[PDB]
Amino acid sequence: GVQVETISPGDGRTFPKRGQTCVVHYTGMLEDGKKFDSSRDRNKPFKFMLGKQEVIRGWEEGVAQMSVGQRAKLTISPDYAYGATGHPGIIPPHATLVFDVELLKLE
Amino acid sequence: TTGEMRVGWARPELRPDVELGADELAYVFNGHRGQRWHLGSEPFGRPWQSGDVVGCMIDLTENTIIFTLNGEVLAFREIEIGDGFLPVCSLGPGQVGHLNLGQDVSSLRFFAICGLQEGFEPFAINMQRPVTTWFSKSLPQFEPVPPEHPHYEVARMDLAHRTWGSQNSLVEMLFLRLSLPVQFTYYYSVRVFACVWVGWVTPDYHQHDMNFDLSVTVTMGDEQGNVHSSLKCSNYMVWGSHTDLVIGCLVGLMTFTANGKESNTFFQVEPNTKLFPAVFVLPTHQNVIQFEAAMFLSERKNPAPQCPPRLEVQMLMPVSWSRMPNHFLQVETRRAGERLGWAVQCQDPLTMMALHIPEENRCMDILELSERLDLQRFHSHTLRLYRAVCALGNNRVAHALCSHVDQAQLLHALEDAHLPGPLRAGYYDLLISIHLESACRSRRSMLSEYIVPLTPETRAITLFPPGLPGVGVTTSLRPPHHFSPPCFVALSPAIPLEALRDKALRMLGEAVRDGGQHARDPVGGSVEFQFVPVLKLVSTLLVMGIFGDEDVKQILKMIEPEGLLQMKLPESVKLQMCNLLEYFCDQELQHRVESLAAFAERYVDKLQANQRSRDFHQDLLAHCGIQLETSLSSRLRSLLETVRLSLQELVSHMVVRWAQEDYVQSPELVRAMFSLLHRQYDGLGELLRALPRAYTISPSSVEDTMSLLECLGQIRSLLIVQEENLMIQSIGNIMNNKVFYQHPNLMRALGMHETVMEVMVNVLGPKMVTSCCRFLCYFCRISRQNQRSMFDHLSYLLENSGITPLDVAAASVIDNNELALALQEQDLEKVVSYLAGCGLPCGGERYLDFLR
Amino acid sequence: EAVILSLQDLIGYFEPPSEELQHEEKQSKLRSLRNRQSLFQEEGMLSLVLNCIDRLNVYTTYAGEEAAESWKEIVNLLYELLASLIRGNRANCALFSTNLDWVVSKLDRLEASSGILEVLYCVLIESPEVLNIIQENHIKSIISLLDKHGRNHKVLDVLCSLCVCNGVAVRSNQDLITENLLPGRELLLQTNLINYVTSIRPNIFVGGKWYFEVMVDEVVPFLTAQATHLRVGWALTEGYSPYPGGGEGWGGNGVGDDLYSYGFDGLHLWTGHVARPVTSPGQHLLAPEDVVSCCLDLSVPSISFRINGCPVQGVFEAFNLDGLFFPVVSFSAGVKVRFLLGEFKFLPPPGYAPCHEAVLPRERLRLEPIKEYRREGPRGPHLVGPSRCFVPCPVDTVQIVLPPHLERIREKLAE
Amino acid sequence: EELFMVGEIFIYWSKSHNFKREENFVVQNEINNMSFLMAKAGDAQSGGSDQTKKKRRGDRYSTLKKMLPIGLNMCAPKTRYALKDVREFLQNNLHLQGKVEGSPSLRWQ
């Protein structure tokens, strides 16, 4: 399913734990790279506790494969993403995503 | 440097693709040799060398094109005044030059020698702004064939096909990309009459030569070095009496049927990428080529499968060309380099506001649209469409728009001055729409309500400064808007507020300053876009009720001063500005009501101690009102002396000037203007009408009241049409507040019920009726007079109730003898008539109970 | 002929009043218009024209068509004629409240689609209930027609009309528009701000084996909200023109099919703008520690880029070997980088002549912005170009001979 | 141009000659003298009346010459120029009034 690919190493250590207040920058574009988001576009960092399960399954799994300070592309599978639903008018059904994840800090 | 370089005036109409000079749409001279061209070359004195500053001049009216050489005359005289002429320059191969236009600080021998003497106008006297020049790329890009393309001559008919062949025996190399590419079985076929390179082409193609084949593959290693040999082979497709057939079936892997029959896949297979079914064709004179398992016409679009070949209007057949204007890109790069180490440096960020058309991928900057007027206009309509889809409230949809637009891109819309104006108006309106619209809805009606808390802070408000709307004392409520900033896993779109208000205020300083110092760029290409979108943004954000007081003061200093109002204005701009002044009037009125209620609360205990020092008590308050004919009453008098009333008068003093000089054409402008005029005069009476909507409230309860208020902002937002459940939620929450018991008077002071009734109006053209009528019934229950206020609509409610809503009529009638009297017999006629309709019953018991 | 004449006469009879008129007189003539509209409306001339639109659409060119050649015009006018009836009275649209599915049915005819679009525009602009009726269906066909037919300003105006009635907004249609346009990010003009690409090359060209190195000196990965790219690689002369406006896909390098490139992180080479995912000896950014090294080969394709001389796999194949090839470094914003044409930090076996040694004719070393229309001198922004561009090719001499007196003269001259 | 000056006044005397050329039938006889066998160059002196650095500020005026343009309307009708009224500027107003009346001679062309 999800097939995360590292961009740059961070600490190379601490993988995310349940309940950590993960804090990141990132950007999101489609399988074909059509841009749809960036936290930098707000400049304000995206923030999310992980194990809070608020995110798509491939994000909760994909961040877990990363470590503190680490940067990585995340090519989340649709089943782990919005999938057959798609993102209502945003992401078409069964569409894999691509994320330039940039974890600022696990908390 | 010295060398040939045609220079002089020309026309917008000119084709860049053609070599400059010989064409009708030019008037220019050589450097080398020194002669000139219009329709052909003419002799022309003194060729220039390097360091020979030129200068080129035109008279319109009298029609002349006097080129200067270091201010010396040595031409293209008696020209027709047509399009309105471009200044123009054009380099040869490797010759070098430096055009410079305007800025009298930069003015030199070119200008002082001749310019401001005879009387002439360098371009930056026109403008604060640097000019955006244009130039050809060497790179071809397809453009759809104009009728008579040099004389290549497209035609269409639909078995799918189209005819071809220039009627002229014209020389060379059509490069016919088809207009619509592909994404990842399908018959294609091409027929040719009297050699050709049939195939498929990538979007990035840009080769215009007689040469072929000429344009690559890739094979990965595994750093062992092993062989991850698979990698790439697609960078395209080609080939080499009677006609012939050649298809191009694909999804997936490529096919090539020479003469309609297979000749192996010389190139094949791909990941998931676009391919134009382009063909390159050297003409074989008259009648050259023709075109057309599901059809391509199906795969290309929505109707897949929808197999039979539906030939389409987009199926244009453009030739790739060569030379097209593509904007100078004023701001560009800040590189710097070195050697003996060969370090190079750039550092400074800066950005194009780019777009592309996916069907023909291109890095097409939005500024480029300014000449690409058609596609420009289309984009402006896309903006109106997003403005429509954002749809007043309807926030849920708006996040999807947030996916498609970016906050920063709007901020850049705040940034750019060179952006053509309609688009600018579209983007600032997007900023109004995606975000601010929920705010103005949330605080418009609530601006009308003028409620106040009895906080001790409200006891401290006063009226006079030790006037102006600059104070942030505000009080009241107007419940805060809840933003919902848009995460993309897994109900009110947001902005960085403080920045945007800062960007916007700055935008106004930088707006008014230009015309205050006077110029004619004019920013948007029109004054209307130089203000209206901006003043819209400001007046709207101001309605949103942000702006710290100092910034609103910045607006006032920007206007009064005590100036935007100094300025002569276009009608529309005057409209928005009138909306702005209107906000000031509403704000000042809020100040007035606020001070007066604040005095009420200040005077309460002073009166109640007097009540008890030794309903009908409200009549005793009317005895307090009998003070008109007890030193505290003298304090009341003095407060009238305060209440009786530069701002209101400046509105008079200038709006009347507008209505004078301008001739205020187009209504609504007029309407709002004289609405201002009337509301400035006798603000006391505007207050008089305003008061009933105002209602003082106990501070301890205010929190809950605030919540109750948002419920209105739920339903009044829901007044405009799933959603019925949202409504039941809202009205249910309106039941839930204890305040609705505690302060019925504010509730009826609000339209509230009629608003609910208004929903009933819309509902009555179905389950929502239940919540509505329950609400209205209990609303009748809560107090006596309120039962009257609801009593007023019985003709409506009765006539509507053919069927529960009628129970509301009942509750409106139940208690009061007065109300019992109050109904006219006609309403009873309606009841008994419905009972007459009970000839075919059990609604009859209902109506009879109403009679009961 | 009588039909065409009657059509034009009707369309003319119903001509909407011009806006240039004084407001009052225009309002009166407008009432006359509403009135006349109703007056053909109760008479069923409407539905008569509907029947015409039906029966004329029965075929598409039958009857001896050359006598019927006027048809492409005929049926056209009627749609317009229909439009003419619609723009005023709401009752017209009310009669189309049932017939709208038929209107969409005739929408696909293509033959007079723009005017049909005027019909539907004129319908939708008025009565709201008709807007309520339209479903999760016909609109999809509308947008599909927009896919079918260029970029009419008009079509989005329809959708803009579908979004909102008169003040009330029919949300289902709106979300419907959303689902049916926005996810594709195709037929609509998608857009985003993009940082300028900028590229520079050291001195002058090549065209055996040849090699150079480039230390990164200073790169910020996410200065500006867009990521900072820093591609590096070889490119042929006339097939890479990094104009400031960008390359095909939101700007970039590797954008040339006539180009070869590598850099940044995760390795992954670019060609055709397209990236392809090369492995690295521990994948890493072009952070300053890292040093790109490039050894292009004559004839032999692949450019084995290397991380401080650590291999980055086999790469390129099957070159467009035409004309001089040159080193390039694309980058943007907060970039500062060192060239190392030769101060090499690594020394490949490759058999390369160092690029420092490339300066053989009279080519003084100096980095240049590639081709380029502009030079930002302190005097001001230069406008320049087009400029100009190997294994020398002398003309033949031997096929000639010296005659007796002149051969003797050239011998006495020879001494 | 750098002087903006008496050299222009020396040209101004030539401008008075231009008024003389504007003044009879014998002026046509100069063409009769040409039968056996101009003023526009002196117009630069009129520009000097607008003045050095103030001339650079003149584009910002849209400098003093605009007031002289008022005299040009009077030129069609020259002590009378004084009635419109820095007395030197009135002299500059007169030469402009003359050049404007000379400009009326340009209407013949």
From Swiss-Prot, chain A:
Belongs to the FKBP-type PPIase family. FKBP1 subfamily. Transmembrane segments: none annotated. GO terms for cellular component: cytoplasmic side of membrane; cytosol; intracellular membrane-bounded organelle; ryanodine receptor complex; sarcoplasmic reticulum; terminal cisterna. Disulfide bonds: none annotated. Signal peptide: none annotated. This is Peptidyl-prolyl cis-trans isomerase FKBP1A. It is an enzyme of class 5 (isomerase). Keeps in an inactive conformation TGFBR1, the TGF-beta type I serine/threonine kinase receptor, preventing TGF-beta receptor activation in absence of ligand. Recruits SMAD7 to ACVR1B which prevents the association of SMAD2 and SMAD3 with the activin receptor complex, thereby blocking the activin signal. May modulate the RYR1 calcium channel activity. PPIases accelerate the folding of proteins. It catalyzes the cis-trans isomerization of proline imidic peptide bonds in oligopeptides. It catalyses: [protein]-peptidylproline (omega=180) = [protein]-peptidylproline (omega=0). One of its GO terms (molecular function) is peptidyl-prolyl cis-trans isomerase activity. The modification N6-acetyllysine is found at residue 52. The modification N6-succinyllysine is found at residue 52. GO terms for biological process: regulation of release of sequestered calcium ion into cytosol by sarcoplasmic reticulum; regulation of ryanodine-sensitive calcium-release channel activity. It holds the Pfam family FKBP_C. It is found in: Cytoplasm, Cytosol; Sarcoplasmic reticulum membrane. Residues 19-107 form the PPIase FKBP-type domain. Inhibited by both FK506 and rapamycin. Detected in fast twitch skeletal muscle (at protein level). It is a peripheral membrane protein. Interacts with TGFBR1; prevents TGFBR1 phosphorylation by TGFBR2 and stabilizes it in the inactive conformation. Interacts with ACVR1B and SMAD7. Identified in a complex composed of RYR1, PDE4D, PKA, FKBP1A and protein phosphatase 1 (PP1). Interacts directly with RYR2 and RYR3. Interacts directly with RYR1. Interacts with GLMN; rapamycin and FK506 abolish the interaction with GLMN in a dose dependent manner. Its EC number is 5.2.1.8. It comes from the Eukaryota. Keywords: Acetylation, Cytoplasm, Isomerase, Membrane, Rotamase, Sarcoplasmic reticulum.
Curated annotation (Swiss-Prot), chain B:
The calcium release channel activity resides in the C-terminal region while the remaining part of the protein constitutes the 'foot' structure spanning the junctional gap between the sarcoplasmic reticulum (SR) and the T-tubule. Pore opening is mediated via the cytoplasmic calcium-binding domains that mediate a small rotation of the channel-forming transmembrane regions that then leads to channel opening. Binding of [3H]ryanodine indicates that the heterozygous channel is activated by Ca(2+) concentrations 4-fold lower than normal. Single-cell analysis of cotransfected cells shows a significantly increased resting cytoplasmic Ca(2+) level and a significantly reduced luminal Ca(2+) level. The N-terminus is blocked. Channel activity is modulated by phosphorylation. Cytosolic calcium-activated calcium channel that mediates the release of Ca(2+) from the sarcoplasmic reticulum into the cytosol and thereby plays a key role in triggering muscle contraction following depolarization of T-tubules. Repeated very high-level exercise increases the open probability of the channel and leads to Ca(2+) leaking into the cytoplasm. Can also mediate the release of Ca(2+) from intracellular stores in neurons, and may thereby promote prolonged Ca(2+) signaling in the brain. Required for normal embryonic development of muscle fibers and skeletal muscle. It is found in: Sarcoplasmic reticulum membrane. This is Ryanodine receptor 1. It comes from the Eukaryota. Homotetramer. Can also form heterotetramers with RYR2. Identified in a complex composed of RYR1, PDE4D, PKA, FKBP1A and protein phosphatase 1 (PP1). Repeated very high-level exercise decreases interaction with PDE4D and protein phosphatase 1 (PP1). Interacts with CALM; CALM with bound calcium inhibits the RYR1 channel activity. Interacts with S100A1. Interacts with FKBP1A; this stabilizes the closed conformation of the channel. Interacts with CACNA1S; interaction with CACNA1S is important for activation of the RYR1 channel. Interacts with CACNB1. Belongs to the ryanodine receptor (TC 1.A.3.1) family. RYR1 subfamily. Detected in skeletal muscle (at protein level). Fast- or slow-twitch skeletal muscle. It comes from Oryctolagus cuniculus (Rabbit). The gene is RYR1.
